[PDB]
């Protein structure tokens, strides 16, 4: 068995939910319709490290339908949906993923992606957060020569690529999928607008209405989180280091504050910074009894979880814990500080993941075919492909596009078929 | 008298409202505090073409406080606030602007900006919409040699610059002020979110709640217009040619439709496209009795106003007209299709105009000092200045910034003092 999952008998349930998800993921299904016969990824050998959800199962089966061979792992110890992993394993696709991995198991799973039976090695990487990219660069430099490139899903992974490139550590081309407009402005924003609430509601019976909620970070994720909680009746506070993002939050009516000032005043804290130790021991010591602390950024290091190691952790249910302080005060920590929407719920819904994952497939096609055209730098896909991703999703939600006339296209200086915006337009 | 205004005796009223506006415009006042003694614009001779409002009066007096000499005109026949123009004229600043200009008067006013007494000619242009840039390039090529550059306020003006540059027609450097983040994502969005309603409410006693409103265009302006009307209880429809913007609108719950389909169904139509004849004769013929038609894009050519020339126009009050069709059906047209927020109300409020106009002052300083470093292309100001503009506005609205620690700045790859985002970050 060239796989490792929790329970293979969950595969039928996984197939049933994959069938539903396909009907919500028109971008991926359109790529199958366009490319499954020509098989543009025939000869592609993709090592993948990305949350092993039902939506990712549709991504994997799209890559395979286009001719790729893949080996898969999750990029978080809690984000796997076991029945999705089983459905993939039952297809004979190598997948190494279960919910509740230890850290040792996590890195073992990544490692299994880099070598398969009969001398299988990847020539492509598909990464979400930079861990797979790190393992290959730091532990398997011999593999790098054969890797055509990496496509990277998320803001933190791209930040890690930028720092590698600045220091001459990046040894392959990288496609930044996060900053396709149809990824960053949809998945990060509208996805979290729904899936933060999902994680909070599944974890506890805390009401949102009337609570004071603090969001740390007002980028794409924090913007979606703030809209989510404000719509449900919370008073929303925002912390920011960036004066432009702070000004955006203020102009939406949120008070912009520091956690150093407001720790005792908040009912719910959500870290969405992509940064390091933005919630410290002293912050948590000051929090009210039964305050809820969670992280929706990529890494649990947004919170100094280590500082709680000597306190009693009383489990409430899976991925919901009380941390009991010496004076008896308790805080509720979700998923041990790991990604709350994937650890306490199921991540983003299928429709917006289709937009993200359509970009991933297009990036893998571009790297597999044309990686010779790229240097060891970070690139984004062209705007015409970004627009194509959007076009493929309009039919499902019933949006009807207006067509420019010749004179209207000339008036604003565009081709009738796009691209319709200048390169650095911000949407 | 080196000026032309409607009534100089309105100057005292203008001064009173300028004094209030200063307290809402901390960016401009901060630039006065930083630069009025060093006078970095001493020797600058600025021809300006930008809506002659109270807020623009604060911009003009900031330029003058920094040492500039200016000659001013409005960029729209209806956008001048006469008491603001009088306050400027009473200071001895040449201004040629009144509400209700004819087209001949409009272009005469622009022309007055290009030559003053004693051989005064500009060495800088400050433009909003591209009309001043057009006049100089097409009618006064001898002036071009002495023009160090132009700073351009709005999306349509930048579109015109791009097309000039593509065809080799741009003969001076241009700073695109519209696409400072602290302009496009604030003025265009939050400004119109307030000032569209202002124009509609001052013009008619039409209720927004329960109406079906169609917004043509879902860029920065259309996004703000949609939020405005949705918050007041309208059913909001959106038309788009851009599939990414269409998908954004759909994900906010707006049905994305074509005016060709829905003309008979709408109560209010707002053009926000920057394009040509997006509302045609047949659209207007199909509109319901007493439907309200207005334009918030830069030019009245969004609507084919010419097609209504043979119908009786019955005036309701200034800038509010009935167009009476042969079957007796009437539509309400606002400001003859000119910018509705400035024609039927007073434009954006002071606070957000401060952010836009702080960018304008910084652009004029950069052109006056460093235009030799630029070619005849379109440029944007650097991100550190964009962040500075935001910083200068945080105090007024009580936003408190968090400061990165050394390790947090290193973790995300930024300097503690910024810039905090990659060059092409979209906010
Ligand atoms: N949970 C999900 O489904 C999901 C989806 C996309 C991205 N992410 C992750 O979420 C994180 C945020 O992503 P993003 O796209 O919003 O990034 P972003 O860069 O757009 O936003 C992060 C924001 O945090 C702010 N910030 C940084 N340090 C801070 C501090 N100490 N205090 C306060 N604010 C601070 C920055 O100024 C920035 O505006 C990343 O780790 C990303 O990988 C999660
Ligand atoms: N009234 C104000 O205070 C104010 C402020 C800023 C800008 N403006 C003006 O408003 C206009 C829009 O500015 P913006 O920043 O939103 O520009 P933008 O480019 O961001 O948005 C315009 C949108 O219109 C869409 N569009 C173009 N042709 C269309 C058509 N035929 N049908 C439907 N949609 C169409 C485009 O796809 C685009 O998304 C410009 O003329 C700009 O100069 C006015
Ligand atoms: N449902 C989902 N599947 C995969 N990755 C995700 N990231 C966020 N939500 C996700
Ligand atoms: N109040 C205002 N002053 C000047 N230009 C504007 N454009 C939009 N609103 C404005």
Task: Pick the closest to residue A304 from A343, A264, A336, A330 (CA basis).
Answer: A336
Task: Pick the closest to residue A311 from A328, A294, A286 (CA basis).
Answer: A328
**Scanning the structure block, which residue is given the tokens 């200034």?**
B318
How many Å lie between the alpha carbon of A403 and the closest alpha carbon of chain B?
Answer: 6
Tokens of A416: 């009738």
Residues 6+ apart with CB under 8 A from A128: A49, A50, A51, A75, A152, A153, A154, A157
Task: Pick the closest to residue A95 from A159, A10, A6, A12 (CA basis).
Answer: A6
Q: Determination technique for this PDB entry?
A: X-ray
CA dist B358 and A42 (Å) reads 55
Tell me the β-bridge partners of A319.
none
**Scanning the structure block, which residue is given the tokens 């167009």?**
B323
CA dist B81 and B99 (Å) reads 6
**N-terminal to C-terminal alpha carbon distance within chain B:** 47
CA dist A356 and A375 (Å) reads 24
Distances (CA, A) of B362 to A245, A323, B182, B420: 20, 52, 12, 20
Task: Pick the closest to residue B31 from B402, B422, B389, B420 (CA basis).
Answer: B389
CA dist B140 and B134 (Å) reads 9
CA dist B116 and B127 (Å) reads 18
Backbone phi, psi, residue A262, to 5°: -110, 10
Residue B58 and residue B30 in contact, taking contact as beta carbons nearer than 8 Å: no
- Report the nearest atom of ligand 3 relative to the CA of A350: 1
**Scanning the structure block, which residue is given the tokens 């500082």?**
A307
DSSP structure string for B31-93: HHHHHTTT-TTTT-EEEEES---HHHHHHHHHHHHTT-EEEEE-SSTT---HHHHHHHHHTT-
Residue B388 and residue B365 in contact, taking contact as beta carbons nearer than 8 Å: no
Residues 6+ apart with CB under 8 A from A109: A4, A73, A74, A96, A97, A101
Residue A206 and residue A182 in contact, taking contact as beta carbons nearer than 8 Å: no
CA dist A82 and A12 (Å) reads 11
Would you call A227 an interface residue with chain B, using a CB distance cutoff of 8 Å? Answer: no
The reply to whether A8-183+348-391 and A190-343 are identical in fold is: yes
Residue B282 and residue A424 in contact, taking contact as beta carbons nearer than 8 Å: no
Residue among B277, B400, B418 minimizing CB distance to A257: B400
For residue B419, say if its preceding peptide bond is cis, omega within 30 degrees of 0. Answer: yes
CA dist B44 and B37 (Å) reads 15
CA dist A182 and A100 (Å) reads 31
Torsion (CA) A256, A261, A265, A270 in degrees, nearest 10: 60
Task: Pick the closest to residue A340 from A396, A380, A294, A379 (CA basis).
Answer: A294
Residue B200 and residue B206 in contact, taking contact as beta carbons nearer than 8 Å: yes
How many Å lie between the alpha carbon of A95 and the closest alpha carbon of chain B?
Answer: 31
Chain B residue numbers touching A248 (CB-CB < 8 A): 185-186, 427
DSSP state of B314: E
Judged by phi (left if over 0) then psi (alpha if -120 to 50, else beta), residue A135 lies in: alpha
Is residue B270 classed as helix, strand or coil in its secondary structure?
A: strand
Does any ligand 1 atom lie closer than 6 A to the CB of residue A62? Answer: no
Q: Is B140 exposed, middle or buried (0-12, 13-18, 19+ CB in 10 A)?
A: middle
Tokens of B136: 């100089």
Is residue B168 classed as helix, strand or coil in its secondary structure?
A: coil
A269 Cα–ligand 4 center, Å: 39
Chain B residue numbers touching A277 (CB-CB < 8 A): 407-408
Strands of the sheet containing A312-317, edge to edge, are A255-256, A235-239, A212-216, A268-271, A291-295, A330-334, A320-324, A312-317
CA dihedral (B112, B11, B62, B382) positive or negative: negative
DSSP structure string for B204-249: -----TT-EEEEE--SHHHHHHHHHHHHTT-EEEEE-S-HHHHHHH
Would you call A241 an interface residue with chain B, using a CB distance cutoff of 8 Å? Answer: yes
Angle of the A383-394 helix axis to the B243-251 helix axis, nearest 10: 50
Task: Pick the closest to residue A216 from A337, A330, A321 (CA basis).
Answer: A337
Residue among B186, B243, B275 minimizing CB distance to A390: B243
CA dist B402 and A246 (Å) reads 10
How many CB atoms sit inside 10 A of residue B370's CB? Answer: 12
CA dist B384 and B392 (Å) reads 12
Distances (CA, A) of B49 to B52, B135, B170, B271: 8, 11, 18, 23
Task: Pick the closest to residue A14 from A45, A64, A67, A60 (CA basis).
Answer: A60
Does any ligand 3 atom lie closer than 6 A to the CB of residue A196? Answer: no
**Scanning the structure block, which residue is given the tokens 């200063």?**
B22
Angle of the B54-65 helix axis to the B82-90 helix axis, nearest 10: 20
Testing ligand 4's pocket by substitution, the residue of B52, B54, B76, B79 carrying the most ligand atoms inside 8 A of its CB is B79
B356 Cα–ligand 4 center, Å: 9
CA dist A326 and A311 (Å) reads 8
Residue A169 and residue A194 in contact, taking contact as beta carbons nearer than 8 Å: no
Would you call B420 an interface residue with chain A, using a CB distance cutoff of 8 Å? Answer: yes
Residue B44 and residue B68 in contact, taking contact as beta carbons nearer than 8 Å: yes
Give Cα B377 to chain centroid, integer Å.
Answer: 22
CATH number of the domain at A190-343, out of 3.40.50.720, 3.40.50.300, 1.20.1290.10, 3.40.640.10? Answer: 3.40.50.720
CA dist B393 and A18 (Å) reads 49
Residue A23 and residue A93 in contact, taking contact as beta carbons nearer than 8 Å: no
Which residues of A are annotated as catalytic?
Answer: 51, 74, 79, 128, 153, 178, 183, 187-188, 192, 298, 348, 356, 360
Helix (H) or strand (E) holding B398: none
CA dist A321 and B25 (Å) reads 48
Is residue B286 classed as helix, strand or coil in its secondary structure?
A: helix
Residue B331 and residue B312 in contact, taking contact as beta carbons nearer than 8 Å: no
Task: Enumerate residues preceding breaks in chain B (C to N > 2.5 Å).
Answer: none
DSSP state of B313: E
Would you call A185 an interface residue with chain B, using a CB distance cutoff of 8 Å? Answer: yes
CA dist A335 and B318 (Å) reads 62
How many Å lie between the alpha carbon of B250 and the closest alpha carbon of chain A?
Answer: 7
Is residue B287 classed as helix, strand or coil in its secondary structure?
A: coil
Residues 6+ apart with CB under 8 A from B348: B55, B187, B191, B192, B194, B195, B341, B356
Residue A59 and residue A32 in contact, taking contact as beta carbons nearer than 8 Å: no
Residues 6+ apart with CB under 8 A from B109: B4, B73, B74, B96, B97, B101
Give Cα B395 to chain centroid, integer Å.
Answer: 24
CA dist A336 and B166 (Å) reads 55
Would you call A6 an interface residue with chain B, using a CB distance cutoff of 8 Å? Answer: no
Furthest C-alpha separation in chain B:
73
Convert B139-152 into a string of H (helix), E (strand) and C (coil).
HCHHHHCCCCCEEE
B245 Cα–ligand 4 center, Å: 25
Helices (H), B335-378: 340-343, 350-370
Residue among A181, A250, A412 minimizing CB distance to B275: A412
Residue among A185, A244, A399 minimizing CB distance to B390: A244
Residues 6+ apart with CB under 8 A from A112: A4, A71, A73, A94, A96
Testing ligand 1's pocket by substitution, the residue of A297, A339, A347 carrying the most ligand atoms inside 8 A of its CB is A297
Task: Pick the closest to residue B242 from B234, B253, B231, B250 (CA basis).
Answer: B250
Distances (CA, A) of B344 to A258, B196, B214, B221: 41, 9, 19, 17
Task: Enumerate residues preceding breaks in chain A (C to N > 2.5 Å).
Answer: none
Residue among B181, B240, B261 minimizing CB distance to A244: B181
Furthest C-alpha separation in chain A:
73
Tokens of B55: 């807020």
Are the Cβ atoms of A244 and B387 closer than 8 angstroms? yes
Would you call A184 an interface residue with chain B, using a CB distance cutoff of 8 Å? Answer: yes
Convert chain A into a string of H (helix), E (strand) and C (coil).
CCCECCCHHHHHHHHHHHHHHHHCCHHHHHHHHHHCCCCCCCCCEEEEECCCCHHHHHHHHHHHHCCCEEEEECCCCCCCCHHHHHHHHHCCCCEECCCCCCHHHHHHHHHHCCCEHHHECCCEEEECCCHHHHHHHHHCHHHHCCCCCEEECCHHHHHHHHHHHHCCCCCCCEEECCCCHHHHHHHHHHHHHHHHHHHHHHHCCCCCCCCEEEEECCCHHHHHHHHHHHHCCCEEEEECCCHHHHHHHHHCCCEECCHHHHHHHCCEEEECCCCCCCECHHHHHHCCCCEEEEECCCCHHHECHHHHCCCEEEEEECCEEEEECCCCCEEEEEHHHCCHHHHCCCCCCHHHHHHHHHHHHHHHHHHHHHHHHCCCCEECCCHHHHHHHHHHHHCCCCCCCCCCCHHHHHHHCCCCCCCCCCCCCCC
Give Cα A274 to chain centroid, integer Å.
Answer: 12
Task: Pick the closest to residue A214 from A277, A275, A279, A308 (CA basis).
Answer: A279
Which residues of B are annotated as catalytic?
Answer: 51, 74, 79, 128, 153, 178, 183, 187-188, 192, 298, 348, 356, 360
Is residue B127 classed as helix, strand or coil in its secondary structure?
A: strand
DSSP state of B403: P
CA dist A199 and A194 (Å) reads 9
Residues 340-359 of A with CB under 8 A from B: 352, 355
CA dist B70 and B63 (Å) reads 8
How many CB atoms sit inside 10 A of residue A314's CB? Answer: 10
CA dist B201 and B196 (Å) reads 9
Are the Cβ atoms of B394 and A247 closer than 8 angstroms? yes
**N-terminal to C-terminal alpha carbon distance within chain A:** 47
The domain ranges of chain A are 8-183+348-391, 190-343
Residue B259 and residue B291 in contact, taking contact as beta carbons nearer than 8 Å: no
Torsion (CA) B282, B288, B290, B291 in degrees, nearest 10: -70
Q: Name the fold adopted by B8-183+348-391.
A: Rossmann fold (3.40.50)
Give the CA angle between residues B232, B236, B237 to the nearest 5°.
Answer: 170
For residue A393, say if its preceding peptide bond is cis, omega within 30 degrees of 0. Answer: no
Backbone phi, psi, residue B214, to 5°: -110, 125
Task: Pick the closest to residue A335 from A200, A219, A165 (CA basis).
Answer: A200
How many Å lie between the alpha carbon of A258 and the closest alpha carbon of chain B?
Answer: 6
Residue B173 and residue B367 in contact, taking contact as beta carbons nearer than 8 Å: yes
Chain A residue numbers touching B179 (CB-CB < 8 A): 424, 426
Q: Tell me the structure's resolution in angstroms, rounded to a single decimal.
A: 1.6
Distances (CA, A) of B397 to A256, B357, B390: 9, 18, 11
Would you call A384 an interface residue with chain B, using a CB distance cutoff of 8 Å? Answer: no
Chain A residue numbers touching B424 (CB-CB < 8 A): 179, 380, 424
Does any ligand 1 atom lie closer than 6 A to the CB of residue A321? Answer: no
CA dist B84 and B5 (Å) reads 10
3-state helix, strand, coil in chain B (%, to 5): 45, 15, 40
Instruction: For an interface test with A, give the residue of B192, B301, B399 to mutate (most A CBs within 10 A).
Output: B399
Does any ligand 1 atom lie closer than 6 A to the CB of residue B402? Answer: yes
CA dist B39 and B31 (Å) reads 11
How many CB atoms sit inside 10 A of residue B227's CB? Answer: 18
Residue B292 and residue B206 in contact, taking contact as beta carbons nearer than 8 Å: yes
Residues 6+ apart with CB under 8 A from B69: B44, B45, B46, B120
């Amino acid at each position: 068995q060239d796989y490792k999952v929790a329970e293979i008998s969950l595969a039928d349930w996984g197939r049933k939910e994959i069938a539903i998800a396909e009907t919500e993921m028109p971008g991926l299904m359109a790529l199958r319709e366009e490319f499954s016969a020509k098989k543009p990824l025939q000869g592609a050998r993709i090592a993948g490290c990305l949350h092993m959800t039902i939506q990712t199962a549709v991504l994997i089966e799209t890559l395979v339908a286009l001719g790729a061979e893949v080996r898969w792992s999750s990029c978080n110890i809690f984000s796997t949906q076991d029945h999705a992993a089983s459905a993939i394993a039952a297809k004979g696709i190598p997948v190494f993923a279960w919910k509740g991995e230890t850290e040792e198991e996590y890195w073992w799973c990544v490692e299994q992606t880099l070598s398969g039976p009969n001398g299988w090695t990847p020539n492509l990487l598909l990464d979400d957060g930079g861990d797979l990219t790190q393992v290959v660069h730091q532990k398997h430099p011999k593999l790098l020569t054969a890797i055509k490139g990496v496509s990277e899903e998320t803001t933190t992974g791209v930040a890690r690529l930028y720092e590698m490139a600045k220091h001459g550590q990046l040894k392959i081309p990288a496609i930044n999928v996060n900053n396709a407009v149809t990824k960053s402005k949809f998945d990060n924003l509208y996805g979290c607008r729904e899936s933060l609430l999902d994680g909070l509601k599944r974890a506890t019976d805390v009401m949102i209405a009337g609570k004071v909620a603090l969001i740390l970070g007002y980028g794409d994720v924090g913007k979606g989180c703030a809209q989510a909680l404000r719509g449900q009746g919370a008073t929303v506070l925002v912390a920011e280091i960036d004066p432009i993002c702070a000004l955006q939050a203020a102009m939406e009516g949120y008070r912009v504050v520091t956690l150093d000032d407001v720790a005792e005043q908040v009912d719910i804290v959500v870290t969405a910074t992509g940064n390091y130790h933005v919630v410290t021991h002293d912050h948590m010591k000051r929090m009210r009894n039964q305050a809820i602390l969670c992280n929706i950024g990529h890494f649990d290091s947004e919170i100094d979880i280590q500082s709680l190691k000597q306190y009693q952790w009383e489990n409430i249910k899976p991925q919901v814990d009380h941390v009991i302080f010496p004076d008896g005060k308790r805080i509720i920590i979700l998923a041990e500080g790991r990604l709350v929407n994937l650890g306490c719920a199921t991540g983003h819904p299928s429709f917006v993941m289709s937009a993200s994952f359509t970009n991933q497939v297009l990036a893998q096609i571009e790297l597999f075919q044309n990686s010779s055209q790229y240097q060891n730098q970070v690139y984004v896909l062209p705007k015409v492909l970004d627009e194509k991703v959007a076009r493929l999703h309009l039919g499902r939600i019933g949006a009807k596009l207006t067509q420019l006339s010749n004179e209207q296209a000339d008036y604003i200086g565009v081709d009738k078929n796009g691209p319709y915006k200048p390169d650095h337009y911000r949407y």
